């Protein structure tokens, strides 16, 4: 019980999402960032911060943007800004305060029961139990078919139909939750690999890594994403799912269950899923290519020794008197590099 | 006008006094004269028991049992009355012992604050004698101007709210009520005016947190050492897949040397080679990132919420001391120590070797945060500062160590005349006047103070200063200075001791 409070305090101090939520300008920052991912970031942030004085804009806009970049809420790669998982967690929390779909329903209970049955029968190696389960399910389906042949077709009521539609939307919309998480997982592996290469720099490690064709940057989330995207490619079931969704969306009870944006999201589910899954493998390939290029450049030892020398110089610099203009202007010991020759004074000759 | 002044003190079986006793106070001045050890300090201890949480006497049990003159079931009560133009307030206490179990947790106490004229000491005693505790807490439902508290904390909070004073006025009044000798100016100002707000407690917590962080650092180092040993086995397996079995066995032996239980029972067989590899993967993808993340989080939190805030707190305390000194200097202007002259206080920061070392270490800590070493340099820089704090806190009875964690010792005070006894008395009186006055006002609501002690001219200015600041005084003297008090004080309280009993007689000159 005591450790929970310490964990909460640590999360409050460190985690980017809670810091963003507790920030002074949280609502406008959240709105602007969410609009963006749907210089230019700095310009739009300044524009939004302009007509919200209430409660020198361009200076504080840049200061806050660099503060969030430091906190790793957003990431800067070369000259571009990319979103992380903390931003999406904050957005999900904020925009769920208005409308949240209930999960204490009968449909969710039936789904849970069927899923538990499926898992339990899938973990069983004995063949006799499998045969018994198959026979029981076949008999139940045959009984239902016999009942239906007598003219007892069952149709969900309006309330049950609305409940089912909302539950299906809630389950289907959760497949995009962890797309940024995989990329965040790969970036830290990249950083750790580069740090290990620099601190080691031994050329044998670099040569061995370059020689092998086995891919680097392996993480637990990457394997889960690979397993997901492999099954995503089996179009023989994606087509059936899309057709069933199209059939479902043409029902009288749809307007009372979902509004326009939700209907749009359910309408283009498969296309958007495939399109967004294809945009993560490219990021992984780019990361691996950049790592291999950095390794092939071969300037790690220079970085290490220049860092050591800079640390020595900075340690020494604390023992001099910077308050005297005489010492601040004393000539140092550094050679001329990139000498630009004096213009010949012929001028007009 | 609008200032309460003390009028009387009543005792009942308190210390060496047996039964009921009463002492009067004059509106101008009063001297508590009597032979040494006859009970002069007992009266003031009884008065100060009602005003501060921890008086500097040796405890309530000794006074209750008359350390023994009273054993077993017993009752003791004390009271004090303050009056003004058309108003009266009374502060009292009743403490009793049920039996012979003389212990700290067996003494039952109640504190009383009253305004109605029907609440007297004898009424409280009668109610206790008739109903014990319930009859004492019952009078709140049968009257209006009575407030009982079975708690000194709430009682003192209410008392400090009644007279619109700060949280340290009564502590200062108690400190200057038994001071023996007027010492040097720095010693007086550093011991009898400023409050003790040293930061020796936070240093221990910071040191404990750092010692906790060292364990996480050690775990991270162990994990890195294990991974560095395990990698050559992975290299050797690739070499073998391309004799070399001896080198592979040697590498597996080296890997097993550094293991701590993961590779518990394995061998140098080629069948066990995959197992080693799996362990390496678990090191690379799961354990090391988690340990590094936890280490970085703990390092940042300890470096920011730990040692950084302590020094800022100390600097803020020094700034508050300087501001209060400026306010005291402003207060002291409205008086003439000499014709057309007044005193002024100046504060100058001192320097010490420990302070210079601490500041240099702090600069190193600030400079080490810009290195990208995965926190190694930052940890090394923080370690030296924590070590300095530990060394300072270990020996808390030295000038160097107290110069670090005690704000009052980071300054030196001087007095300007823009005589030691007169200057000390003026500073003490100005501090008392500043403490006992509501903000934005110059008239105290609590007026009575107690003093201990010099020719006639020496004491002739103290009385003038007290009258100028608007304070009523009660002096304590032995039977030695009964010549000048006759000219200033206009009443006297005499304590006669006969055996193990004392009696008080109040008379005018």
Give the neighbor-by-neighbor strand order of the sheet with B502-507. B448-452, B472-477, B29-33, B492-497, B502-507
Rg, Å, chain B Cα set: 34
Q: How far apart are CA B348 and CA B407, in angstroms?
A: 13
* CB of A322 less than 8 A from some CB of B: no
3-state secondary structure of B11: strand
Instruction: Please report the DSSP string for B146-190 in residue order.
Output: EEEES-HHHHHHHHHHHTT--SSHHHHHHHTSS------HHHHHT
List the resolution, Å: 3.0
Count of CB pairs separated by less than 8 Å, A with B: 31
Mutate to test the interface with B, among A184, A188, A196 (most CBs of B within 10 A): A196
Contact at CB, A14 and B364, closer than 8 angstroms: no
Query: Which of A8, A11, A199 would you mutate first to test chain B, the one with the most B CBs within 10 A?
Result: A199
Helical H segments across chain A, by residue range: 2-14, 16-21, 26-36, 40-50, 57-70, 85-95, 106-122, 127-149, 158-172, 179-199, 203-211, 220-232, 235-249, 254-257, 260-267, 269-297, 300-316, 325-328
User: If you count them, how many residues does chain B have?
Assistant: 509
Say yes or no for a CB contact (<8 Å) between B285 and A314. Answer: no
Burial letters for B301-335: b for 16+ Cβ neighbours within 10 Å, e otherwise? Answer: bbbeebbbebbeebeebbeebeeebeebbebbeeb
Q: Which method, experimentally, gave rise to this model?
A: cryo-EM
Task: Check: CB of residue B21 under 8 Å from CB of residue B504.
Answer: yes
B235/A208 Cβ within 8 A: yes
Measure CB to CB from residue A195 to each of B284, B300, B374 and give the nearest one: B374
- Which tokens belong to B346? 């100046």
Q: After which residues is chain B broken (C to N over 2.5 A)?
A: 57, 67, 242, 418, 453
Q: What are phi and psi of B329, to 5 degrees?
A: -60, -40
Distance (Å) from the C-alpha of residue B283 to the closest C-alpha of chain A?
12
Strand partners, B111: B93, B149
Q: Do A219 and B285 touch (CB under 8 A)?
A: yes
A3 touches chain B (CB under 8 A): no
Test B304 with A13 for CB contact under 8 angstroms.
yes
Q: How many CB atoms lie within 10 A of CB B188?
A: 21
> Does A220 lie at the interface with B, CB-CB under 8 angstroms?
yes
| Cβ distance of A318 and B364 shorter than 8 Å | yes
Structure tokens at B278: 């799996």
Give just the sign of the alpha carbon dihedral B417, B420, B425, B431: positive
To 10 degrees, what angle do helices B200-241 and B245-258 make? Answer: 170
Q: What distance in Å separates the CA atoms of residue A11 and residue A17, rounded to the nearest whole number?
A: 9
Chain A contacts of B367, Cβ < 8 Å?
314, 318
On chain B, the residues whose CB falls within 8 A of the CB of A10 are 297, 301
B contact test, residue of A15, A182, A203, A208 with most B CBs within 10 A: A208
As a whole number of angstroms, the distance between CA B132 and CA B290 comes to: 64
Contacts of residue B350, Cβ cutoff 8 Å, sequence gap at least 6: B403, B409, B410, B411, B412
Residue A326 exposed, middle or buried by CB count within 10 Å (0-12, 13-18, 19+):
exposed
State the Cα–Cα distance between residues A150 and B216, nearest whole angstrom: 71
Contact assignment for A208 to B289 by CB distance below 8 Å: no
What distance in Å separates the CA atoms of residue A95 and residue A111, rounded to the nearest whole number?
A: 26
Cα–Cα distance for residue pair B252/B270, rounded to 1 Å: 10
Q: Select the residue of B301, B367, B377 nearest A13 (Cβ to Cβ).
A: B301
Task: Please say whether the beta carbons of B282 and B230 come within 8 A.
Answer: no
The alpha carbons of chain A give a radius of gyration, in whole angstroms, of 30
Closest listed residue to residue B324, CA positions, set B404, B434, B172: B434
Verify whether the Cβ–Cβ distance A14 to B235 is below 8 Å: no
Q: Hey, is the C-beta of A96 within 8 angstroms of any chain B C-beta?
A: no
**Minimum Cα–Cα distance from B288: chain A residue:** A192
- Contacts of B300 by beta carbon, 8 Å cutoff, 6+ apart: A13, A14
Residue B408 near residue B321, CB atoms below 8 Å: yes
Taking a C-beta distance cutoff of 8 angstroms, is the pair B15, B497 a contact? Answer: no
Minimum distance, in Å, between the CA of residue A219 and any CA atom of chain B: 6
- Residues of chain B with Cβ-Cβ distance to A315 below 8 Å are 364
Is B305 in Cβ contact with A192 (below 8 Å)? Answer: no
Report CA B481 to chain centroid distance, whole Å. Answer: 36
Sign of the four-CA dihedral A3, A6, A12, A16? negative
Residue B235: list chain A partners with CB under 8 A. Answer: 208
Q: Does A196 touch chain B (CB under 8 A)?
A: no
Q: CA-nearest residue of chain A to B370?
A: A311
CB contact under 8 A, B289 and A311: no
Nearest to A311 among B304, B360, B371 (CB): B371
CA distance B9 to chain A (A): 50
Distances (CA, A) of B285 to A103, A186, B238, B492: 35, 11, 20, 87
CA-to-CA distance for A71 and A21, rounded, in angstroms? Answer: 13
Q: Does A308 touch chain B (CB under 8 A)?
A: no
């Amino acid at each position: 019980a005591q450790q929970r409070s310490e964990r909460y305090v640590s999360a409050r101090s460190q985690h980017p999402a809670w810091l963003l939520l507790a920030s002074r300008r949280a609502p406008l920052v959240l709105g602007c960032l969410r609009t963006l991912f749907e210089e230019d970031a700095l310009q739009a942030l300044s524009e939004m911060l302009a007509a919200y004085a209430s409660q020198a804009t361009h200076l504080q806009a840049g200061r806050e943007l660099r503060e969030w970049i430091k906190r790793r809420l957003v990431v800067e790669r070369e000259g571009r800004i990319y979103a992380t998982d903390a931003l999406e967690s904050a957005i999900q929390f904020v925009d769920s305060l208005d409308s949240r779909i209930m999960t204490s329903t009968a449909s969710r209970l039936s789904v849970v029961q069927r899923e538990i049955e499926n898992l339990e029968t899938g973990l069983n190696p004995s063949p006799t139990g499998r045969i018994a389960s198959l026979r029981r399910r076949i008999q139940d389906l045959e009984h239902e078919l016999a009942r239906v042949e007598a003219g007892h077709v069952d149709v969900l009521d309006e309330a049950q139909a609305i409940e089912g539609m909302r539950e299906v939307y809630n389950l289907a919309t959760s497949l995009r939750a962890d797309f940024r998480r995989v990329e965040d997982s790969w970036r830290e592996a990249d950083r750790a690999l580069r740090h290990s290469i620099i601190s080691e720099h031994r050329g044998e490690i670099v040569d061995r890594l370059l020689d092998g064709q086995d891919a680097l940057l392996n993480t637990p989330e990457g394997r889960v994403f690979e397993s997901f995207q492999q099954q995503l490619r089996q179009s023989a079931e994606l087509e059936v799912m899309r057709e069933r969704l199209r059939t479902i969306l043409r029902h009288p009870a749809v307007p009372k269950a979902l509004n326009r944006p939700q209907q749009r999201e359910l309408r283009w589910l498969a296309l958007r899923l495939v399109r967004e899954s294809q945009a993560v493998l490219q990021a992984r390939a780019r990361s691996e290519r950049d790592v291999r290029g950095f390794m092939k450049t071969g300037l790690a030892a220079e970085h290490h020794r220049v860092g050591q020398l800079l640390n020595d110089f900075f340690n020494l610099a604390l023992s001099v008197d910077w308050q005297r203009q005489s010492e601040r202007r004393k000539p140092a010991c550094l050679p001329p590099v990139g000498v630009a020759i004096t213009g010949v004074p012929a001028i007009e000759r | 006008s609008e200032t309460f002044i003390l009028t009387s003190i009543e005792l009942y079986n308190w210390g060496g006094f047996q039964g009921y006793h009463r002492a009067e106070i004059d509106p101008s001045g009063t001297a508590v004269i009597g032979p040494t050890g006859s009970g002069k300090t007992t009266l003031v201890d009884a008065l100060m028991t009602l005003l501060c949480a921890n008086p500097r006497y040796r405890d309530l049990v000794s006074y209750v049992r008359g350390v023994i003159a009273r054993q077993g079931k017993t009752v003791t009560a004390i009271a004090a009355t303050l009056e003004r133009d058309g108003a009266q307030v009374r502060l009292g206490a009743v403490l009793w012992f049920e039996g012979t179990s003389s212990s700290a947790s067996d003494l039952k106490k109640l504190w009383l604050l009253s305004e109605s004229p029907e609440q007297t000491l004898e009424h409280w005693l009668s109610q206790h004698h008739a109903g014990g505790m319930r009859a004492l807490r019952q009078m709140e439902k049968d009257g209006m101007g009575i407030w009982p508290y079975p708690s000194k904390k709430a009682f003192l909070a209410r008392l400090r709210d009644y007279f619109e004073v700060g949280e340290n006025a009564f502590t200062l009044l108690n400190r200057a009520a038994g001071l023996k000798q007027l010492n040097s100016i720095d010693e007086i100002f550093r011991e009898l005016v400023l409050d003790d707000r040293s930061a020796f407690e936070r240093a221990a917590e910071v040191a404990s947190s750092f010692d906790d962080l060292t364990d996480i650092h050690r775990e991270l180092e162990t994990a890195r050492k294990q991974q560095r040993s395990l990698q050559p086995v992975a290299d050797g397996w690739e070499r073998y897949r391309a004799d070399q079995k001896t080198e592979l066995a040697k590498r597996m032996s080296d890997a097993l040397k550094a293991d701590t239980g993961a590779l518990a029972e394995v061998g140098r067989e080629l069948v066990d080679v995959p197992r080693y590899l799996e362990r390496l993967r678990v090191l690379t993808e799961e354990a090391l990132p988690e340990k590094l993340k936890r280490f970085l989080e703990y390092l940042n939190r300890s470096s920011d919420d730990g040692v950084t805030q302590l020094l800022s707190y100390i600097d803020h305390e020094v700034s508050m001391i300087e501001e209060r000194l400026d306010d005291l200097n402003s207060t002291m202007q409205r008086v003439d120590f000499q014709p057309g002259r007044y005193l002024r206080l100046v504060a100058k920061k001192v320097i010490h070797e420990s302070l210079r070392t601490l500041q240099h270490a702090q600069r190193q800590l600030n400079s080490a945060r810009f290195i990208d070493d995965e926190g190694e340099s930052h940890y090394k820089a923080l370690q030296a500062l924590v070590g300095l704090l530990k060394d300072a806190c270990e020996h808390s009875r030295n000038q160097g160590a107290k110069a670090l964690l005690d704000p009052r010792f980071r300054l030196e005070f001087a007095v300007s005349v823009i005589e030691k006894e007169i200057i000390a008395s003026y500073v003490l009186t100005a501090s008392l006047s500043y403490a006992l006055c509501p903000d934005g006002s110059s008239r105290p609501l609590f007026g009575t103070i107690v003093l201990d002690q010099s020719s006639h001219a020496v004491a002739g200015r103290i009385i003038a200063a007290l009258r100028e600041f608007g304070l009523h005084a009660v002096f304590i003297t032995p039977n030695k200075e009964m010549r000048l008090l006759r000219h200033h004080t206009r009443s006297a309280v005499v304590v006669h001791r006969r055996g193990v009993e004392s009696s008080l007689v109040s008379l005018s000159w």
